[PDB]
Design a protein around this ligand. Structure first.
Ligand code: CHL
Ligand code: CLA
Ligand code: CLA
Ligand code: CLA
Ligand code: CLA
Ligand code: CLA
Ligand code: CLA
Ligand code: CLA
Ligand SMILES: CC1=C(/C=C/C(C)=C/C=C/C(C)=C/C=C/C=C(C)/C=C/C=C(C)/C=C/C2=C(C)CCCC2(C)C)C(C)(C)CCC1
Ligand SMILES: CC1=C(/C=C/C(C)=C/C=C/C(C)=C/C=C/C=C(C)/C=C/C=C(C)/C=C/C2=C(C)CCCC2(C)C)C(C)(C)CCC1
Ligand SMILES: CC1=C(C/C=C(\C)CCC[C@H](C)CCC[C@H](C)CCCC(C)C)C(=O)c2ccccc2C1=O
Lengths: 732, 107, 37, 80, 152, 119, 68
């Protein structure tokens, strides 16, 4: 038979074109290759991890190199308010002279792309000032990428392959990753901030030439070893400091001020230094918890066996969970993906509201692009967390090792779980859609004073607790006679109060009944996606329609038309149905984010507060209104710089629509069509001298679902990316 | 077609609120909704829905309200039929509202 | 000593646009269709 | 080849055998049920995996099970 | 026994508090590695003490040179590659062996002393020695870490 | 070809992993020897197709000088495209009194004979 | 302030308290390799309890430097 794929002779003996696709698709599923043991599994995963690291550092070195060669960084740092950040130059021989003139914007020789990734703001805040610095960084990270690719090749070699005991050592890996990978890395970044990034913002160049002969503070290490640590908070940066120069500067390296730098509208470098120093100490201290080869330390299996409550209300508690987290990679992968997805949501929510980098939040397209980019990344990672949890249930879960613990008791009350998730999804859907349709009927019949406008009094109460004097609750940070106010008032509250009472930033935006309705729609999307994903995880072992679902695996097509027909019965198919709800939910949160920020940036937040309460106001004042300059990117009168985003907008609509073909139409139609094509080719003279090596067949059911979801998702992403970038950049 | 036909001529339907043509805006939105609602039936399959109904049936059994006529997910062919019917109704009614609002306001 | 010359996109963009995809697709096609002994 | 298994809950009703469109199953002598018959799958190399047998089986749960496996030219139902 | 009571597990003084030498051939590799790190450290300490007596050792690379230091690295890599390759493809009294091992250990500690000491005091090491001899009580490590601004 | 190297004008150098390749090595070497002689001594369709078809339809020093001339022709193209001068002018600037890549390449190359021994 | 007095007293207090009252509880919960001490209070016990001593001492010095 054939050689490809080498990991599966069952696929290598396939005479069809299914072999190529299934070799492409089952390549990185190492647990199901021929002759795979457990040590070999962990070793190939370790090498693949090194490959991922090398690709990430090559990606970063490429961003640095293309900025350093084809951008305007050294010209951008002189006036970062009026100059657009260039990503990379364009060489497209399919262009015409109007397109070359249109994408030749300025100040550049030829056609360029204008970056919306925030890298100029990030690099300028961390201390880059010249192009050479970016060249040195690019060469350094390319060398680091080569070292990690070499280290993957090296740790594949038989004198360097680690044993199974090295991979299954959890206490040593948590101590080294908490203390070293979190704590020492955060401490070294604090060192970079204090030694380089703060004096570069003071106007003093501290490169590799003079970082040993320039004092970070006029009394170096004498307060640090005397204990007089408040001597590094004395004389901070003045509220009339021009960033990157020496006018209005100070001497402090570690403050705690709160709020924002006044010019850049961004977090203080001294506060970020103090922040990374404090969390560095906390992670280094937390990295001495677990028992390595030194007698002291905690034993995780002992902790888990101890935390079982009395009265049997959790049964056996956490008994036997160490041997099920340790032995399963899908449990660990689902935990890692759940944490990293929630942290990516945290990154987006905290970076729009608390912008860190200098002259971020004045680049509105950068704000919108970074928020939307980490929100969609977070949604995909959360869906993958639940997917690999269902894979954990099918492949790795041993019930006799878990007889009575929390993981078995979840499978015991799975019906109560899915029932109450079904209830909250139905409730939020009926009442959110009913309130929007009610208000639409009121807006249609000319009576806006009848529409149900519930005030978000709970979140307004929370904003008043945070120190916002708009809603008049006046308690705990908004009342001047409070203990929390009076205790934090001397040191960090005077900046936080000014920044939260400024209504010209994203720090705790003013909310109203539209914000109520959209947060309810967000809860609907979250609960519903959680319903499909939890149902797919807990019905993965089997259901009453199919008791032996664990015997077919994770991703099987169906179980046939018997028993009333069983389509999309698998846990993979439940994931597949939940990717749609993920895309819907992130589309809701980013429509909401983008329209509330466009109405903040234009100046009329009254437009959002009036039109946000009804879906015709949505469709008219956001989607119809902000796509006026997008679709005029090219026309029969000419073109301009938005023509690439108009073309990509139509491109995304097309890929979405092409995905609907695989989504709606299914296999046997196409199999009959391909059989008539096979007849036509084998009967056509002077073309039947050419014959296929792989027998052409229609795409399988699971592959069809994957290809349709892939086209659907890529078109969704490209359509909203083109609309968001083009509307924000064309109107600002 | 996207700009000079759909986008340009959709002005009348999207700004029909507060007048006699407001019903065409309501049926524009409603038709968009029904069209989208069809995609759940067209893109999904009855195995998932049968298992979901199993969980819900459990919840009803817990409160002694499970019906004697047993809740079943729609058949494969009925899922397809419901799908295509809501798809057609949605799309056709959308173009209906667009057309009528447009031509009545500019006629 | 870092800046690549002014003619560099005119070679590198059609190289990785046409030549390396042609070589890569031909090589992967011959690797796919290869018989096992 | 697809993995077809017969389980001891079989009551020898022959419904699976007369439902298979490929002559894969057959009835053998047995003593475990009143019919003194059991199904058997001696020719699973020609099985396509249509699951008509599973649709035809009356027992709850199934006494015949089809586990879709590695594809060949016979299991894909190709005439070319 | 580096601190008494602890027997050596399997210049031997029973000093492996991390367990780095629990494998036999691996430990033989670390023995050769200790030998060559100590040899380069002994040559480095003799270099710093010689150059100083008969520009500091940290500012030594940047004065002016014949090529200059742009294209001297590949000559270094070729010559050291031949020497190193010869050493790896190759790879008398035990009193002299233990003196060689302990001398390399003390030279490694002395060289990290040169690096940290010079980086914290900005003095040549014989000036650090004459400073600690002219003032024992005072001009110590406490003085140059609490009075760092004076040295800069 | 190196001290300690093992085998998988041959010298056992095959890091990437035959008779067509040997014939291709010989003809790239012959045309590179003719081209190097032409570049050192510097300072039609159907007949060529017939000669090539007759050549297709059809001892250590030859490929030794061939490998040396292939490296020489790479040298001509490289230090002409980088230096902008001919071979005599680059030799004269070399005598009588891409750098990172050259240095990085040499060190990396040496790291390379070492690595094979390690593995 | 008196940094030597504060750091030395805090380290002495934490080492004495882990040496005398928490040693038996640490030996109960845990259930280099040989010391002269009659309680088995080894180098790693010294490192942990002196680490707590230095940490609490520098925390007290920093709070007193802030004057809070
Ligand atoms: C392998 C032994 C070796 C050691 C221990 C050093 C040590 C040093 N070199 Mg030296 N070099 C060494 C090899 C070589 N150097 C040089 C030529 C130079 C020059 C021209 C310079 C140094 C400098 C330095 C200093 C860099 C400190 C710094 O700021 O780090 C941060 C920077 C990096 C890590 C890069 C440090 C004393 C610098 C100096 O003089 O500082 C006072 C300097 O300007 N070295 C060459 C010939 C190319 C070497 C080849 O073996
Ligand atoms: C999976 C796809 C994905 C992609 C394409 C991006 C893309 C981006 N991210 Mg996002 N991000 C993601 C997922 C992703 N992210 C996830 C999953 C998280 C949660 C973990 C984040 C959290 C995050 C934050 C907090 C930030 C970004 C930023 C960015 C932007 C800058 C590029 C960059 O990251 O530099 C490449 C980064 C590196 C190569 C590593 C940086 C250095 C690391 C952290 C430490 C190095 C330690 C050092 C080696 C130790 C030396 C020790 C010493 C003793 C020797 C870029 C748009 C930044 C931004 O928005 O700027 C405007 C930004 O601030 N991302
Ligand atoms: C973690 C990364 C890191 C690194 C590699 C450095 C390195 C350095 N610092 Mg920096 N610094 C850092 C973090 C770091 N620092 C942080 C977190 C702060 C804020 C507190 C500072 C604030 C700071 C000041 C105010 C000064 C330095 C100075 C120095 C230089 C000499 C230090 C010295 O002689 O210590 C003494 C030598 C020792 C061996 C004692 C340290 C032992 C540690 C604490 C225990 C092991 C860990 C050296 C380049 C000094 C300088 O002159 O820069 C040119 C200087 O005046 N640093
Ligand atoms: C920490 C990161 C991580 C790691 C190490 C893994 C590892 C794994 N995953 Mg998991 N997973 C993850 C995150 C991760 N995953 C995320 C973020 C998601 C959500 C998307 C998932 C959802 C998921 C599912 C549903 C499944 C896996 C499976 C697997 C296993 C096999 C992978 C494989 O063979 O597919 C090979 C990969 C492909 C064939 C990729 C195809 C390309 C995709 C469809 C995207 C196409 C878009 C395209 C690139 C855009 C082009 C645009 C154009 C204009 C240029 C492997 C254990 C599988 C498994 O365990 O089977 C039992 C499986 O079914 N993962
Ligand atoms: C606009 C399109 C749309 C709408 C409204 C819905 C609505 C719903 N989806 Mg669906 N879904 C969709 C598209 C849509 N989906 C798409 C594109 C996919 C990808 C295949 C899915 C895949 C999917 C999955 C996997 C799941 C859902 C679920 C749900 C329900 C979640 C609970 C809820 O909020 O119900 C609120 C109820 C509604 C929104 C329906 C409105 C009720 C009407 C207005 C009442 C009658 C009005 C009027 C009298 C009608 C008269 C007409 C006459 C001819 C009879 C909800 C009914 C979940 C579910 O079913 O949980 C129980 C679930 O698990 N959906
Ligand atoms: C850096 C070079 C180096 C290397 C490769 C070694 C290697 C060795 N030493 Mg030596 N040692 C060294 C430097 C080195 N040492 C120095 C500078 C001193 C003086 C402080 C000593 C003092 C010493 C004593 C008293 C003893 C040893 C012993 C050993 C052997 C067993 C210990 C072990 O397995 O750890 C392997 C060591 C390493 C892998 C060193 C790597 C550096 C670590 C990871 C970080 C160091 C950072 C530093 C503390 C700051 C092993 C051959 C024992 C022996 O059996 O002698 C024959 C023994 O009794 N060493
Ligand atoms: C494009 C011209 C060309 C071609 C087709 C070959 C082809 C070959 N070389 Mg040659 N080689 C070349 C140029 C070429 N070489 C040059 C320019 C040098 C000097 C750097 C060498 C130095 C060299 C050595 C030392 C060896 C080969 C060897 C080989 C053979 C096995 C290597 C392999 O297939 O992978 C193969 C016939 C091996 C061989 O078997 O030689 C006959 C071998 O040992 N090559
Ligand atoms: C007051 C608190 C206290 C503290 C912090 C210590 C700490 C120590 N003692 Mg102990 N010791 C104590 C009380 C204390 N002891 C008392 C009250 C007595 C009298 C009963 C002793 C009698 C004693 C003996 C006989 C020995 C120790 C030793 C040690 C050291 C063992 C670890 C090591 O060798 O590192 C360094 C360690 C420093 C051993 C040692 O080596 O002393 C230096 C040792 O042999 N101690
Ligand atoms: C299926 C499955 C899985 C998965 C799962 C998942 C995916 C999950 C997720 C999860 C999640 C995702 C969760 C979340 C959570 C969260 C939380 C729990 C939070 C909390 C918070 C808090 C508690 C806070 C508080 C506060 C506030 C609010 C304010 C103030 C400050 C503070 C801090 C106080 C696994 C793998 C296991 C396996 C089995 C199967
Ligand atoms: C023998 C004996 C004795 C004596 C004893 C002694 C005297 C002891 C001492 C001991 C000691 C004296 C110890 C110490 C220890 C210490 C340590 C171990 C430390 C650590 C530290 C740390 C860990 C730190 C850290 C840090 C840093 C670095 C920075 C900042 C932050 C912090 C603070 C965190 C007596 C007479 C009683 C009795 C008899 C016997
Ligand atoms: C939602 C959905 C279901 C679930 C929908 C079902 C089971 C039908 C629900 C219709 C109504 C709501 C149930 C019947 C209502 C009764 C008449 C009860 C009386 C109600 C009073 C108000 C009169 C499927 O069964 C299905 C099958 C195949 C492909 C796609 C899908 C699919 O998308």
């Amino acid at each position: 038979h054939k050689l490809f794929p080498k990991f599966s002779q069952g696929l290598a003996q396939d005479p069809t074109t299914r072999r190529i696709w299934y070799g492409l698709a089952m390549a990185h599923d190492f647990e199901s290759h021929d002759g795979m043991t457990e040590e070999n599994l962990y070793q190939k995963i370790f090498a693949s991890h090194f490959g991922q690291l090398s690709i990430i550092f090559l990606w970063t070195s490429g961003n640095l190199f293309h900025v350093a060669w084809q951008g305007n960084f050294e010209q951008w740092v002189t006036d970062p308010v009026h100059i657009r950040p260039i990503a990379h130059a364009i060489w497209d021989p399919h262009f015409g002279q109007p397109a070359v003139e249109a994408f030749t914007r300025g100040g550049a020789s030829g056609p360029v792309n204008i970056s919306t990734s925030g890298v100029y703001q990030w690099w300028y805040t961390i201390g880059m000032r010249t192009n050479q610095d970016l060249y040195v960084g690019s060469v350094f990270l390319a060398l680091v990428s080569a070292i990690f690719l070499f280290a993957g090749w090296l740790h594949l070699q038989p004198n360097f392959q680690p044993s199974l005991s090295w991979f299954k050592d959890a206490e040593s890996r948590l101590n080294h990753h908490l203390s070293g990978l979190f704590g020492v890395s955060s401490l070294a970044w604090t060192g970079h901030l204090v030694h380089v990034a703060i004096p570069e913002s003071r106007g003093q160049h501290v490169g590799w030439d003079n970082f040993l002969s320039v004092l970070p503070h006029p009394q170096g290490l004498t307060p640090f070893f005397t204990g007089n640590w408040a001597a590094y908070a004395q004389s901070p940066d003045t509220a009339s400091h021009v960033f990157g120069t020496a006018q209005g500067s100070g001497q402090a390296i570690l403050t705690f001020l709160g709020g924002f730098h006044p010019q850049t509208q961004s977090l203080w470098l001294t506060d970020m230094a103090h922040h990374h120093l404090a969390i560095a100490v906390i992670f280094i201290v937390a990295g001495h918890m677990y028992r390595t080869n030194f007698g002291i330390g905690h034993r995780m299996q002992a902790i888990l066996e101890a935390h079982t409550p009395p009265s049997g209300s959790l049964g056996a508690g956490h008994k036997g969970l160490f041997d099920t987290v340790n032995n399963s990679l899908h449990f660990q992968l689902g935990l890692a993906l759940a944490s990293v997805g929630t942290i990516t949501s945290l990154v987006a929510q905290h970076m729009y509201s608390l912008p860190p980098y200098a002259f971020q939040a004045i680049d509105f397209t950068t704000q919108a692009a970074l928020y939307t980019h980490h929100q969609y990344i977070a949604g995909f990672i959360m869906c993958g967390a639940f997917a690999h949890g269902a894979i954990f249930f099918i492949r790795d879960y041993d019930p006799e090792q878990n007889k009575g613990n929390v993981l078995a008791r979840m499978l015991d009350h799975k019906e109560a779980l899915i029932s109450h998730l079904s209830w909250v999804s139905l409730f939020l859907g009926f009442h959110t859609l009913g309130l929007y349709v009610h208000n639409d009927v009121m807006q249609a019949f000319g009576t806006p004073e009848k529409q149900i406008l519930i005030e978000p009094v709970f979140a307004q109460w929370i904003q008043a607790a945070h120190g916002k004097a708009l809603y008049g609750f006046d308690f705990l940070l908004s009342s001047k006679t409070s203990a929390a106010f009076a205790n934090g008032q001397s040191l960090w509250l005077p900046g936080w109060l000014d920044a939260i009472n400024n209504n010209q930033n994203s720090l705790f935006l003013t909310i109203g009944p539209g914000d109520f309705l959209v947060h309810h729609a967000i809860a609907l999307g979250l609960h519903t996606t959680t319903l499909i994903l939890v149902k797919g995880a807990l019905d993965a072992r089997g259901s009453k329609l199919m008791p032996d679902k664990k015997d077919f695996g994770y991703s099987f097509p169906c179980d046939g038309p018997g028993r009333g027909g069983t389509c999309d019965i698998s846990a993979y198919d439940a994931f597949y149905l939940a990717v749609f709800w993920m895309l819907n939910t992130i589309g809701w949160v980013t429509f909401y984010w983008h329209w509330k920020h466009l109405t903040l940036w234009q100046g009329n937040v009254a437009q959002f507060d009036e039109s946000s309460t009804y879906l015709m106001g949505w469709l008219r004042d956001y989607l119809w209104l902000n796509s006026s300059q997008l679709i005029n990117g090219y026309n029969p009168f000419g073109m301009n710089s938005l023509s690439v985003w108009a073309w990509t907008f139509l491109f995304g609509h097309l890929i979405y629509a092409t995905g609907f073909m695989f989504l709606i139409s299914w296999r046997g139609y196409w199999q009959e069509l391909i059989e008539t094509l096979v007849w036509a080719h084998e009967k056509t003279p002077l073309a039947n001298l050419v014959y296929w090596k792989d027998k052409p067949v229609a795409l399988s059911i699971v592959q069809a679902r994957l290809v349709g979801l892939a086209h659907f998702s890529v078109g969704y992403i490209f359509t909203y990316a083109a609309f968001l970038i083009a509307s924000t950049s064309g109107r600002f | 077609w996207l700009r000079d036909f759909l986008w340009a001529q959709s002005s009348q339907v999207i700004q029909s609120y507060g007048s006699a043509l407001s019903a065409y805006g309501l049926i524009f939105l409603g038709a968009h909704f029904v069209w989208a609602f069809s995609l759940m039936f067209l893109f999904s399959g009855r195995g998932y829905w049968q298992e979901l109904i199993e969980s819900i049936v459990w919840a009803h059994n817990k409160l002694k309200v499970a019906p004697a006529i047993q809740p079943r997910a729609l058949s494969i062919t009925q899922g397809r039929a419901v799908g295509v019917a809501h798809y057609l109704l949605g799309g056709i009614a959308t173009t209906w509202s667009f057309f009528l609002a447009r031509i009545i306001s500019v006629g | 000593p870092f800046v690549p010359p002014s003619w560099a996109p005119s070679v590198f963009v059609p190289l990785t646009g046409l030549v390396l995809p042609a070589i890569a697709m031909a090589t992967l096609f011959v690797y796919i269709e290869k018989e096992a002994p | 080849a697809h993995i077809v298994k017969i389980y001891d809950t079989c009551i020898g009703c022959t419904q699976c055998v007369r439902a298979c469109p490929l002559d894969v199953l057959e009835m053998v002598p047995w003593d475990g049920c009143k019919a003194s018959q059991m199904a058997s799958a001696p020719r699973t190399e020609d099985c396509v995996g249509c699951k008509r047998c599973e649709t035809a089986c009356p027992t709850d749960f199934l006494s015949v099970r089809v586990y879709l496996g590695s594809e060949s030219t016979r299991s894909m139902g190709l005439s070319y | 026994t580096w601190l008494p009571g602890l027997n050596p597990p399997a210049g031997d003084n029973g000093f492996d508090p991390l367990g780095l030498g629990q494998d036999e051939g691996r430990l033989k590799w670390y023995a050769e590695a200790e030998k060559t790190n100590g040899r380069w450290a002994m040559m480095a300490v003799a270099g710093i003490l010689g150059q100083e007596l008969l520009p500091a050792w940290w500012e030594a690379g940047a004065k002016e040179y014949d090529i200059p230091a742009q294209a001297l690295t590949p000559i270094e890599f070729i010559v050291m590659g031949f020497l190193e390759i010869k050493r790896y493809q190759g790879f008398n009294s035990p009193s002299m062996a233990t003196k060689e091992v302990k001398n390399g250990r003390l030279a490694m500690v002395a060289f990290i002393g040169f690096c940290v000491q010079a980086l914290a005091t900005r003095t040549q090491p014989i000036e650090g020695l004459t400073a600690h001899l002219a003032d024992p009580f005072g001009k110590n490590i406490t003085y140059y870490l609490t009075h760092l601004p004076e040295t800069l | 070809w190196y001290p300690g190297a093992t085998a998988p004008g041959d010298y056992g150098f095959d890091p990437l992993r035959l008779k067509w390749f040997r014939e291709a090595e010989l003809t790239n070497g012959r045309w590179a020897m003719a081209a190097v002689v032409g570049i050192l001594f510097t300072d039609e369709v159907a007949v060529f197709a017939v000669l090539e078809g007759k050549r297709y339809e059809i001892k250590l020093k030859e490929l030794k000088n061939g490998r040396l001339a292939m490296l020489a022709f790479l040298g001509f193209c490289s230090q002409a495209a980088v230096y902008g001068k001919g071979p005599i002018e680059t030799l004269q600037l070399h005598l009588a009194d891409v750098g990172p890549e050259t240095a990085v390449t040499v060190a990396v190359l040496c790291v390379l004979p070492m690595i094979i021994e390690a593995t | 302030l008196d940094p030597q007095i504060v750091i030395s007293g805090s380290t002495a207090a934490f080492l004495a308290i882990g040496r005398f009252v928490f040693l038996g509880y640490q030996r109960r919960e845990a259930n280099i390799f040989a010391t002269n001490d009659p309680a088995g209070f080894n180098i790693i016990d010294v490192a942990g309890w002196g680490a707590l001593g230095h940490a609490v001492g520098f925390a007290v010095l920093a709070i007193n430097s802030l004057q809070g």
